[PDB]
């Protein structure tokens, strides 16, 4: 997958004026309700930690089995989540994916491949950097986690059966 590689770019150069950096993050900060009540100091700290990933159709963001260390926000494009060779979700602009336990857990191992269907742009933040911010901005930590709902949780395997396997397993009993 693209995560964990050089394909993940910093949104802001480190010497960029802080307020311009916050502006560079607007597609997430001004649109996702979890960022609503952040102080300027809080937005500036988050803005400097955010990264972006740009994928082509067919590129994998994650492969099943790979470590999931970031919260990922889809800002442009569409992706498919694939488990056991079946589509289990389609993600699009505004969707958030990662580990449901991002707040307390260091790592999750992905149970699904996440594959771009179109050219895709993600804004991603490592959960260790996010946690450092939330441990300082205590009130923000409450409103942020309250309003941060994942569209897909890569930590959990979906339990499902294929109709054809049930049909065969019916015919053979």
């Amino acid at each position: 997958g693209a995560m964990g590689t050089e394909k993940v770019l910093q949104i802001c150069p480190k010497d960029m004026r802080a307020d311009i950096c916050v502006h560079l993050n607007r597609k997430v900060f001004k649109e996702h309700p979890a960022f609503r009540l952040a102080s300027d100091g809080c937005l500036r700290a988050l803005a400097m930690e955010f990264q972006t990933v740009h994928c082509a159709p067919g590129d994998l963001i994650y492969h099943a089995g790979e470590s999931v260390d970031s919260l990922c926000f889809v800002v442009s494009g569409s992706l498919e989540v694939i488990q056991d060779d079946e589509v289990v979700a389609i993600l699009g602009k505004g969707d958030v994916f990662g580990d449901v336990f991002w707040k307390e857990a260091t790592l999750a191992q992905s149970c699904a491949n996440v594959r771009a269907l179109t050219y895709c742009d993600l804004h991603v933040i490592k959960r260790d950097a996010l946690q450092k911010v939330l441990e300082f901005y205590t009130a923000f930590s409450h409103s942020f986690s309250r309003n941060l709902i994942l569209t897909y949780n890569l930590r959990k395997r979906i339990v499902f059966r294929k109709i054809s396997d049930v049909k065969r397993e019916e015919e053979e009993r």
Binding site: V88, A89, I90, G92, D95, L150, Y152, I163, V166
Partner: protein
């Protein structure tokens, strides 16, 4: 592929896409229109059955439930009116169209299910 192709265009319709190859035909996508209409968040709609059993309740007609299910089992296109419950528990009569969608190899890969409140216009 067939999934991306369907997502366009919303056409001001309310729809979900169910995986046609998986038991219970789980939803892999729902648009804003469906989420607004049903009252449910996209994240909670994900992986629910596209026959919408999660919205059935006391007043839902169990004979209609069976015919909806049969439509999925036989890969047929049919329309129904069914009384289902919005997330806020209000019972609403929905007009529901179910359409199996085939790929280039003519295999059913998904069900396109479209919904409207019959008192809307």
């Amino acid at each position: 592929t067939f999934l991306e192709n369907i997502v366009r265009r919303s056409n001001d319709t309310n729809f979900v896409l169910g995986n046609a190859q998986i038991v219970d035909w789980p939803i892999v996508y729902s648009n804003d229109g469906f989420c607004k209409l049903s009252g449910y968040h996209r994240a909670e709609v994900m992986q629910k059955s596209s026959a919408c059993s999660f919205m059935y309740g006391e007043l839902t007609d169990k004979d209609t439930v069976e015919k909806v299910r049969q439509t999925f089992e036989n890969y047929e296109m049919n329309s129904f009116e069914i009384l289902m419950y919005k997330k806020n528990r209000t019972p609403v009569w929905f007009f529901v169209k179910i359409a199996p969608i085939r790929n280039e190899q003519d295999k059913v890969v998904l069900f396109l299910c479209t919904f409207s409140d019959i008192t809307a216009f």
